[PDB]
Design a binder for this molecule. Structure first.
Ligand SMILES: NC(=O)c1ccc[n+]([C@@H]2O[C@H](COP(=O)([O-])OP(=O)(O)OC[C@H]3O[C@@H](n4cnc5c(N)ncnc54)[C@H](O)[C@@H]3O)[C@@H](O)[C@H]2O)c1
Ligand SMILES: NC(=O)c1ccc[n+]([C@@H]2O[C@H](COP(=O)([O-])OP(=O)(O)OC[C@H]3O[C@@H](n4cnc5c(N)ncnc54)[C@H](O)[C@@H]3O)[C@@H](O)[C@H]2O)c1
Ligand SMILES: O=S([O-])[O-]
Ligand SMILES: O=S([O-])[O-]
Lengths: 329, 329
């Protein structure tokens, strides 16, 4: 027989045909996400698992599945997966380090432009059949001669920076880990204090992970700093901002706009998460939203799927998985 | 008696204070487009006019306004203004050659991202309140590794090519007047014929003016060459494309999407234009629209208005306007 691989969400059939001659598969080829108890059942005696953004794994889980050996995750942010427990149980935990970067970088830029140029309303105005030609309205904010501040300058921060090269903006960032001079210089990046980043940027592009330090980093106090009218764009994790503090900053018109691909309600790790995005936030005019689609480009998705599956075949064939997050003897 | 200046749309208070010493102002300080009869009535004894997108000037307009010395257009595309009739009447026609370029290029790239990533629908999905966490949906097209084809490579075509430099795309173009070798090279642009452009680009961005030769240049036959799912972005003029053929191509699924800032119904000089945007186009899910807001950036609008004024003032003082479109004795 063969090792038992659970796959919690739908993948390309091509991936199944590469995984089949080495594993028996317990798939879920739908557009629906299966309940927490249902998954544990499926994994009970599974050796391998392919996990995705809705999946949530703690100490309890791992204990229910003692035949497990590898969780192959098809994502960058593993904040919903307890790596420490995985390590202590001899369980591999792999991620996808690079492939999510660019498609997310592209979307983030689009959201900056769309937010700045009032695109949701503009398009709604055209579709309302009342367009009778140009009128002096929808006056928005462009990138040319603006200060773009980045918070975090890892993969996505850098990818965004590369993409804003010919846009005539002034590029600054705040890192927890500074770059060398060759890169700062060659991207025209200028490092600043966090407070300073907020009080001076017209655009604020977030590119940091969710962890102990980053939860609600963007608070009521740091939002009191921004230039009245600045635009906040969040393509990383919801909980790095306080959405309630953001709503208020919007309502008093200190914050010119908020855009986001991610939300607090997605972050199952901290039980105290909001159960929804605030109706008042969704109803706000100065917003642009997408439903965690940063990596939803179909050629990439296939490559992401392929990578996560290779990690699994590597782990199961005995070997060390090229993209393992943790270390194992 | 100071020379009479008619301004057809609302301008910044600062431009009025700029002109008011030199001439008497007949203003339209409302958000509204006036009737042609009202414009004719106001301009009948005017020495100058500041024109905008909704304005159209032919020989009949000029015959009825014999005192006109200058028409200062606050725009780039002067297709609605009969240049030759102006010349023959000894009226200066001026435009704004560079200020509209960058905000329109920014918007065009925003339209390309937004269309490729189903942004309108994605946002409507999040506002609906149905978002419960990642699903493998709203799958779309990215720029990385796509072939982006440019029809025209003048001001806006070049500002878009500059702005796509860090984006991992393969750039091609067709022109009536080719770039020099060194500009092409720097930007990584390949020069192709028009049918090849249409046959082999995943994104097609229009950057040409409207004239006799470009009227419905993007017609049924040319569209019949695209790769199934090709995306088309029009930031230039509506009537360079046939909107009926575009719609037919969307409906059969050969064109993957159409995004536009401009529409055939705006091209006033065309007597046979559609009067509205076809409701079936406005209903099509694979679309993204803006109400001619290409230069609707706050700081820039002021600058555009100022360029037209300066041109108006130069002509009224007997000079050749810096940005004259024509040449008078
Ligand atoms: N929307 C999407 O589809 C999508 C896709 C990929 C990743 N993401 C999210 O975005 C996050 C960023 O991804 P990435 O590839 O850039 O991660 P990365 O690990 O390459 O870089 C994150 C950077 O943030 C920096 N950082 C940490 N704390 C900081 C602080 N207080 N101030 C400034 N910088 C700080 C780190 O030094 C690190 O280099 C991911 O962890 C994930 O949560 C979202
Ligand atoms: N959406 C907006 O708000 C907005 C703003 C500014 C301009 N525009 C429109 O876009 C047009 C182009 O803008 P620009 O500033 O780039 O103009 P431009 O005059 O600098 O460049 C247009 C280019 O198109 C080329 N061209 C002409 N016929 C061609 C053909 N058959 N094939 C390929 N190329 C051809 C010309 O050689 C020229 O280089 C303007 O004429 C105007 O109508 C729209
Ligand atoms: O890490 S991402 O897939 O949110
Ligand atoms: O030249 S136009 O499109 O304002």
């Amino acid at each position: 027989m063969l090792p038992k691989l659970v796959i919690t969400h739908r993948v390309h059939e091509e991936i199944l045909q590469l995984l089949a001659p080495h594993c028996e598969l317990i798939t879920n080829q739908t557009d629906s996400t299966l309940t927490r108890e249902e998954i544990l059942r499926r994994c009970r005696d599974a050796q391998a698992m392919m996990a995705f953004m809705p999946d949530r794994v703690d100490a309890d889980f791992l204990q229910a599945c003692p035949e497990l050996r590898v969780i192959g995750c098809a994502l960058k942010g593993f904040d919903n997966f307890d790596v420490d427990a995985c390590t202590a149980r001899g369980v591999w935990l792999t991620f996808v380090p690079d492939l999510l970067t660019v498609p997310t970088a592209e979307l983030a830029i689009g959201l900056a432009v769309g937010l700045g140029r009032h695109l949701r309303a503009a398009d709604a105005f055209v579709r309302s059949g009342k367009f009778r030609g140009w009128q002096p309205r929808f006056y928005g904010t462009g990138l040319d001669n603006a200060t773009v501040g980045f918070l975090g300058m890892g993969a996505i921060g850098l990818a965004m920076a590369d993409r804003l090269q010919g846009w005539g903006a002034t590029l600054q960032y705040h890192e927890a880990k500074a770059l060398d001079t060759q890169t700062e210089q060659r991207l025209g990046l200028r490092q600043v204090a966090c407070s300073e980043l907020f009080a001076s940027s017209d655009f604020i592009l977030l590119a940091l992970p969710l962890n102990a330090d980053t939860l609600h980093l963007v608070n009521a106090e740091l939002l009191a700093l921004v230039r009245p009218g600045a635009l906040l764009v969040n393509p990383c994790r919801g909980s790095v901002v306080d959405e309630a503090a953001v709503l208020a900053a919007l309502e008093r018109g200190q914050l010119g706009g908020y855009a986001a691909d991610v939300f607090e309600m997605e972050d199952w790790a901290r039980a105290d998460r909001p159960q929804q995005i605030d109706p008042a936030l969704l109803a706000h005019p100065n917003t642009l939203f997408t439903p965690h689609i940063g990596s939803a480009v179909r050629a990439v998705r296939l490559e992401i799927e392929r990578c996560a599956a290779q990690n699994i075949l590597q782990a199961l064939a005995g070997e060390r998985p090229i993209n393992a997050v943790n270390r194992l003897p």
